[PDB]
Amino acid sequence: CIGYHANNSTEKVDTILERNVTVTHAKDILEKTHNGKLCKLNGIPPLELGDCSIAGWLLGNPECDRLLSVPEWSYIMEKENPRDGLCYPGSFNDYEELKHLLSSVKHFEKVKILPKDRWTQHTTTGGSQACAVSGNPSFFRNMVLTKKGSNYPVAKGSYNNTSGEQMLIIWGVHHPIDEKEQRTLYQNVGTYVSVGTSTLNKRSTPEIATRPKVNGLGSRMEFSWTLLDMWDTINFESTGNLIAPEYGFKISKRGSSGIMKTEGTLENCETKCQTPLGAINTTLPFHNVHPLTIGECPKYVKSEKLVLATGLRNVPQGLFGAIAGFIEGGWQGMVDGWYGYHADKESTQKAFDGITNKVNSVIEKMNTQFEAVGKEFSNLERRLENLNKKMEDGFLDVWTYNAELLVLMENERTLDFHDSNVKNLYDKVRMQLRDNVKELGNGCFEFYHKCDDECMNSVKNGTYDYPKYEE
Amino acid sequence: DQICIGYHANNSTEKVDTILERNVTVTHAKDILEKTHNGKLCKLNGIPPLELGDCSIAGWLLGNPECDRLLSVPEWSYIMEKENPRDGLCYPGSFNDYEELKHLLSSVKHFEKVKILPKDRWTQHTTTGGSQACAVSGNPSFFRNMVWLTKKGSNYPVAKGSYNNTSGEQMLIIWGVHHPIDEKEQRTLYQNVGTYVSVGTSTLNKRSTPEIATRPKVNGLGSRMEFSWTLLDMWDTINFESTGNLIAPEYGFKISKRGSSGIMKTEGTLENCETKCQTPLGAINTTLPFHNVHPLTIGECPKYVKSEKLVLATGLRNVPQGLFGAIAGFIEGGWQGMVDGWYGYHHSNDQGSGYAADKESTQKAFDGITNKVNSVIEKMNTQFEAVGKEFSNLERRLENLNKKMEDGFLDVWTYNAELLVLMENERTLDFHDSNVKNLYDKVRMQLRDNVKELGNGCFEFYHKCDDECMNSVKNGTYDYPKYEEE
Amino acid sequence: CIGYHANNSTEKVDTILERNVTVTHAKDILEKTHNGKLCKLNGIPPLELGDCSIAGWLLGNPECDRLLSVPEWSYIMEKENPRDGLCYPGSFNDYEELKHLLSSVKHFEKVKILPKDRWTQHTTTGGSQACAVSGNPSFFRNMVWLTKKGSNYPVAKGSYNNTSGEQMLIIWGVHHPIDEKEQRTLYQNVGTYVSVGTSTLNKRSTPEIATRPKVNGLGSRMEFSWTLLDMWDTINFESTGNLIAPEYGFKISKRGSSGIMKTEGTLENCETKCQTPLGAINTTLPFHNVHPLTIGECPKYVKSEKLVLATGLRNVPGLFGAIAGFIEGGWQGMVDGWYGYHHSNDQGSGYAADKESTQKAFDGITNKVNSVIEKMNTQFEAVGKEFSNLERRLENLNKKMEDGFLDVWTYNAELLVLMENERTLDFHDSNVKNLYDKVRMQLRDNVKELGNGCFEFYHKCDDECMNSVKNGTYDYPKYEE
Numbered sequence A: 001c002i003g004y005h006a007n008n009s010t011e012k013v014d015t016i017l018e019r020n021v022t023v024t025h026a027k028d029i030l031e032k033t034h035n036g037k038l039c040k041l042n043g044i045p046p047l048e049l050g051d052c053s054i055a056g057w058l059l060g061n062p063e064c065d066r067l068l069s070v071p072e073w074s075y076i077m078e079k080e081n082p083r084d085g086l087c088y089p090g091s092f093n094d095y096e097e098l099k100h101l102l103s104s105v106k107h108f109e110k111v112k113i114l115p116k117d118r119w120t121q122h123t124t125t126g127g128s129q130a131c132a133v134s135g136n137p138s139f140f141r142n143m144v145l146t147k148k149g150s151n152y153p154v155a156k157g158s159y160n161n162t163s164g165e166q167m168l169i170i171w172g173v174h175h176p177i178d179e180k181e182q183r184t185l186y187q188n189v190g191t192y193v194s195v196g197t198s199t200l201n202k203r204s205t206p207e208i209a210t211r212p213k214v215n216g217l218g219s220r221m222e223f224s225w226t227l228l229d230m231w232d233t234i235n236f237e238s239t240g241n242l243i244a245p246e247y248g249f250k251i252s253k254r255g256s257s258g259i260m261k262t263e264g265t266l267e268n269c270e271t272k273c274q275t276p277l278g279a280i281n282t283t284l285p286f287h288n289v290h291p292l293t294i295g296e297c298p299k300y301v302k303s304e305k306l307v308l309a310t311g312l313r314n315v316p317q318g319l320f321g322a323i324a325g326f327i328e329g330g331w332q333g334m335v336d337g338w339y340g341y342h343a344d345k346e347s348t349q350k351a352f353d354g355i356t357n358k359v360n361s362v363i364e365k366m367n368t369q370f371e372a373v374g375k376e377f378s379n380l381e382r383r384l385e386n387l388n389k390k391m392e393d394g395f396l397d398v399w400t401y402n403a404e405l406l407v408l409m410e411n412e413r414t415l416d417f418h419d420s421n422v423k424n425l426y427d428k429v430r431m432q433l434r435d436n437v438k439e440l441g442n443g444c445f446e447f448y449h450k451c452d453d454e455c456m457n458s459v460k461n462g463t464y465d466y467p468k469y470e471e
Numbered sequence B: 001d002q003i004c005i006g007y008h009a010n011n012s013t014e015k016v017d018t019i020l021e022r023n024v025t026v027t028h029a030k031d032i033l034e035k036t037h038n039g040k041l042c043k044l045n046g047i048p049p050l051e052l053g054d055c056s057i058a059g060w061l062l063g064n065p066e067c068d069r070l071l072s073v074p075e076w077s078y079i080m081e082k083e084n085p086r087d088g089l090c091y092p093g094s095f096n097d098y099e100e101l102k103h104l105l106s107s108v109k110h111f112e113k114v115k116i117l118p119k120d121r122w123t124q125h126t127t128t129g130g131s132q133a134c135a136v137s138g139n140p141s142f143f144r145n146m147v148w149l150t151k152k153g154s155n156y157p158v159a160k161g162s163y164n165n166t167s168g169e170q171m172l173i174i175w176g177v178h179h180p181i182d183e184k185e186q187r188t189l190y191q192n193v194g195t196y197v198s199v200g201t202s203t204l205n206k207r208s209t210p211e212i213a214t215r216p217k218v219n220g221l222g223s224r225m226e227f228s229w230t231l232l233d234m235w236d237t238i239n240f241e242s243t244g245n246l247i248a249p250e251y252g253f254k255i256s257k258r259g260s261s262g263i264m265k266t267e268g269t270l271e272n273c274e275t276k277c278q279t280p281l282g283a284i285n286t287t288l289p290f291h292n293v294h295p296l297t298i299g300e301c302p303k304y305v306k307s308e309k310l311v312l313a314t315g316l317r318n319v320p321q322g323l324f325g326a327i328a329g330f331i332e333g334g335w336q337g338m339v340d341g342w343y344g345y346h347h348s349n350d351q352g353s354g355y356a357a358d359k360e361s362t363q364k365a366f367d368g369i370t371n372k373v374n375s376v377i378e379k380m381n382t383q384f385e386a387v388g389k390e391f392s393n394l395e396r397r398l399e400n401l402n403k404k405m406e407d408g409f410l411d412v413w414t415y416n417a418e419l420l421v422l423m424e425n426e427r428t429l430d431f432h433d434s435n436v437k438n439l440y441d442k443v444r445m446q447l448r449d450n451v452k453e454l455g456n457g458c459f460e461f462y463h464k465c466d467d468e469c470m471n472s473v474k475n476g477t478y479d480y481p482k483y484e485e486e
Numbered sequence C: 001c002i003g004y005h006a007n008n009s010t011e012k013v014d015t016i017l018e019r020n021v022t023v024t025h026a027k028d029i030l031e032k033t034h035n036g037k038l039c040k041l042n043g044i045p046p047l048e049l050g051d052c053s054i055a056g057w058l059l060g061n062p063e064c065d066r067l068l069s070v071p072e073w074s075y076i077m078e079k080e081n082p083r084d085g086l087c088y089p090g091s092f093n094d095y096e097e098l099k100h101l102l103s104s105v106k107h108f109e110k111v112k113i114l115p116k117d118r119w120t121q122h123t124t125t126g127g128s129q130a131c132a133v134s135g136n137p138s139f140f141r142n143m144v145w146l147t148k149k150g151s152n153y154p155v156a157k158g159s160y161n162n163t164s165g166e167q168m169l170i171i172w173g174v175h176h177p178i179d180e181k182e183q184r185t186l187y188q189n190v191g192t193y194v195s196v197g198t199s200t201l202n203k204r205s206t207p208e209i210a211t212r213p214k215v216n217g218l219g220s221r222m223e224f225s226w227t228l229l230d231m232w233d234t235i236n237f238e239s240t241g242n243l244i245a246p247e248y249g250f251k252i253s254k255r256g257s258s259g260i261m262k263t264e265g266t267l268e269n270c271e272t273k274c275q276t277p278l279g280a281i282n283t284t285l286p287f288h289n290v291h292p293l294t295i296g297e298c299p300k301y302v303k304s305e306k307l308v309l310a311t312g313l314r315n316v317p318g319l320f321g322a323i324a325g326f327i328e329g330g331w332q333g334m335v336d337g338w339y340g341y342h343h344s345n346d347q348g349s350g351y352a353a354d355k356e357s358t359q360k361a362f363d364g365i366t367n368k369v370n371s372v373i374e375k376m377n378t379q380f381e382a383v384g385k386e387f388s389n390l391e392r393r394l395e396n397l398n399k400k401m402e403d404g405f406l407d408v409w410t411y412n413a414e415l416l417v418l419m420e421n422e423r424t425l426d427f428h429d430s431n432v433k434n435l436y437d438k439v440r441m442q443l444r445d446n447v448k449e450l451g452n453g454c455f456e457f458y459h460k461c462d463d464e465c466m467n468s469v470k471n472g473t474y475d476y477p478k479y480e481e
């Protein structure tokens, strides 16, 4: 009696031709499980900003005085609409361009470049209520130029970058609301703010205008930035309205990653792929957790499950008509294999090797790399943002189809592999016994001679032979 | 007396390919490529486009007198525009951040024009300024929605003007800066020389100076008019200050959106049909995974594929009058005379001939084929995309990115689609082959000794087999008091 | 006897279920061979710049004098950091766009538009050490440095109505001094401007004087901009100081736009439909792995080392349990076909291939290979793009994209082989099993079915009777016992 396996499972798979097919064993290849924690990345923590925007951090807004500030990070954590940036109303040129820069960094380090002390001939105590530190008229920590007395000589300030690393320098211009607030502030009138490097050349003038009030002020500050190379000097020259640096940022990077909008908090675990909902210690080719991962991640997919069949049709008591065919049922009373007698370890190991290989081919072929996914855009980059979105929308489709289908096409194939293995085991046995048995038709052979147990192992050996001279 | 196994054949000439063969006539087939529109442009999800005809978005908003009698709905889903509309900036000039402005307006949950800075309140300045370029029936005019502030008398007092946005929606606002050809034209129009046009909101700041210059004449003029725009927030004020050269807004636009869509470059006209997917040639009412109508869709569309046909086989090999060597194998032919199923019996008898389909397996197989077709169709995720994008003369790189991309998806989809058919087709045929082979076998292990197996899928009974005994064979009930002859 | 073919092959394929499976024949469908040469593309040369940048070329840096300069090109060859560019320190507005534009050109032509000589009242021979020609201060061949004449600098005016019948590339520049003093020395006037206007252009520039680091000897800089002047359209220059004027223009007609190949090599007069920085690819296969930065009509770039499709059967010197099953071995001695017969006889032994099925199967395998190759659509793409320091986001989009197509194509390609390979082997297995069956239902009783794919006749079988079995003509007066 040849037969096949059947257990207490009720896992269901789908094949190209049938669905809701109950199978003995099955493997899922859709990661759908995070862990709600935010982690280091390949050993390197994010940059946690709580409720500071990169802008408020670098400028040194009084409200970011106490922030983590790790010297090296893999990505950045930032709350969707942080609240704490330019406490002095204004704006920031090429902002996003800069955030994609600081998203990931090999080494960061503040340094003093244009000391507050050295701008004699110029007031430096300038400040604003809006940038007040506990009922005190302060200002941006890292910034610094008003008239001293009734005079405003030109301002010159310079810095040959000797720090052995490229440096991020930030500066700005004051836009008053009034020609009276102008002379009351810089005495002169047709004023400019000039910067210069080996690769940068910029001459902004202020733009005076009536404006609505914000954090108390009708006036704004407009900041810009740049990347002074090593051994390159920068230059400043202004006849009024220059907000100067005092500090630069020695920045050595890296690989460039991306920012993660998130509420949570670093938790001191470890992952290779991190999502807004949590990390994902996984090895599957696909996942459906959240679109906005950072790291080396499986491919996002619009499924709920991708169940692969590994075992056979579970039939307690096809394409080759043996399983659920002429062998009408599975034996729940066979446990040491998938096919056997009344198990056969030759074919079982073969088909165990078979399925294993399959499940490996699906997985180990899926090449994956460190992407960032979530990008940063401004109000005049909607077009650009959508473009990104059409693409990720577009690979979403391509991957979801190849995956729903891969599974259905390989599931009907796996079901046939088994059918055919049971079919060939019944055939291996047919052409050993031959005349010495009645072939019943349920996959059973009745012995026309007397068959003891040694005679039973020979048939399992493939050794039956064959001194029968009986009707 | 005898019984024969066989399969179906019909008058079909439909051809499929498979991985191994080509031009293979089959009994049935489903093509899964959409290639039919209705040549009509329609509402999208129940919502009309914005029909501009030969107006540009710029001409529309500024109120070029040539756009006076336009449709103007309160809410639209996409925008219809010709390829080079003509009626735009009747007065030569330009429009900052124009492309962004259209992606913005490309879809709108609600639009509304509202007078914010009444033309009349600008005392001290002349306001009736107009031009031949913006001619209305011979008479010099100007943009319906703008105000040309010029000197009054010999005087141009500093011009101030506010609007606190109370409208309860975000408001689109536009303005312009006039650029003369001539210090003389500049003194004539504004009297003052060192002029500026300042504009500020809560997040805006922009002091513009007029760029006077000699330039070629356009529509009659060397001067130009440079427009910019902004979104004023709720409860936010906008401030205009000018000592000369300001083209002020008389109106604003309450705008609430929505989800953002795109602009369909066409010649046609809305026709009051309905659709979930629109193309420039016509709308697509379809349910298939792939289409090849036109690359520039808007809506929820099938994947665009560079194929002429995608015929999936549903029936068997048509062989009138494989992997399991049954169909086209030892059963050499199909029975055009067996019409109630895919696989069945013959049976010859001294009570008569007659075909008969094995209904059990014909059903098993119909279900399975239905599922295959549905698998190919139903696993196809489809989202709302606009496809056609808008780009400037200095964005040829950025344009060519969008192209290289939509191009790459053309290649993926086409390969996969074409291959997906060939594969599932070599499988469809084997499926039917196996189905037959197994019917044959079921009968063979029933009759065994009591018949001669001819080898053409036929069984010659050694004993007499009446109709009741024939049915037992189809039943699976053959059993089994036979003996003769031998 | 029924049997199948075996040969001295050691080629291995994988399939979904097995690996390292020696087969009789195989086709690898991955292109991985160039010719190490850079070539014309569809019959049209690149533009060879050597160590010149596009900027250095157009402005006419004296160090770019003796360049190739063809009238029509298909792509552009440039080193990675050319050196010969803006010999006079400065910059170039919208530079990257300008190169995508010039990256392919149906027709180019330099034409003198504002003859250097006509600028009376201004000094014109202005030059510099930075743009040195053999010790002597010079300047861009294609530009004109308008400086004061005497102690006077009259307002400078200049037009060109574009009659050339083609669109014309025009460039100019604004000088930026270090010093109000250098500014009075060179132009005498202080509140200066450089105005330029066409039918769609407008741009009044002011010179940004400033203290800056010295470069090539200078703190001053020269900022260049450009435009496309239309047919029958005029361009107007107006300056009260600081204009670097064009003496020449460029008639340009294009075409289709291509891209720039960053290489060290040099054009070699071969031909190709597909060029890579390592060499050109004359190929016909769907996938390749040579180098990601192609230009032309290329196979899909795939991160694989090999893609071996199986064409023949399992080499044995399956799913239907025939090959490597009850027919335990292959016959290295059967060379005229994939599957055939043995036949032992008192007239002799001898192999023989069943030609009918060997042919059926060859056709089917040919088609498989062609299906994999011929359904692959392929368009002209440039792949390598051009980006500025403030476009790192935009650059990283292009990358994340070409990266995603790397993943898709690699997966599909690798898997596509493994699948069609577990099928190719079954195909052959079935082909055999069925040959065996055809013979078994012919002989039936008249032989003993050994079970190794062999048949022992109970009767005498001569050569004519053997052929009847191969024919399908066995029939059938036997008896014996």
Ligand SMILES: CC(=O)N[C@H]1[C@H]([C@H](O)[C@H](O)CO)O[C@@](OC[C@H]2O[C@@H](O)[C@H](O)[C@@H](O)[C@H]2O)(C(=O)O)C[C@@H]1O
Pocket (backbone or CB within 6 Å): A125, A126, A127, A128, A129, A130, A137, A146, A176, A181, A185, A216, A217, A218, A219
């Ligand atoms: C350097 C300096 O002058 N700091 C002042 C500051 C500046 O004058 C102001 O930021 C210019 O833009 O003004 C501060 O007062 C703000 C307050 O001043 C009143 O005059 C005005 O009527 C109020 O509306 C409001 O603007 C400031 O905090 O910014 C004081 C600071 O010392």
Ligand SMILES: CC(=O)N[C@H]1[C@H]([C@H](O)[C@H](O)CO)O[C@@](OC[C@H]2O[C@@H](O)[C@H](O)[C@@H](O)[C@H]2O)(C(=O)O)C[C@@H]1O
Pocket (backbone or CB within 6 Å): B128, B129, B130, B131, B132, B133, B140, B148, B150, B180, B185, B189, B220, B221, B223
């Ligand atoms: C408000 C106003 O002054 N409108 C004038 C207009 C302006 O002077 C012009 O738009 C300034 O840019 O001039 C109009 O005349 C056009 C015509 O004027 C001649 O003097 C000149 O020789 C011509 O080249 C041409 O500009 C106009 O239509 O623009 C009349 C209009 O009333």
Ligand SMILES: CC(=O)N[C@H]1[C@H]([C@H](O)[C@H](O)CO)O[C@@](OC[C@H]2O[C@@H](O)[C@H](O)[C@@H](O)[C@H]2O)(C(=O)O)C[C@@H]1O
Pocket (backbone or CB within 6 Å): C126, C127, C128, C129, C130, C137, C145, C147, C177, C178, C182, C186, C217, C218, C219, C220
């Ligand atoms: C038209 C002209 O004046 N050409 C000069 C050139 C320019 O004046 C200079 O670029 C102004 O920006 O100066 C040249 O000399 C450069 C050299 O001059 C020394 O006086 C100075 O102290 C040095 O630092 C250095 O700039 C030049 O080659 O650029 C000479 C040229 O004839």
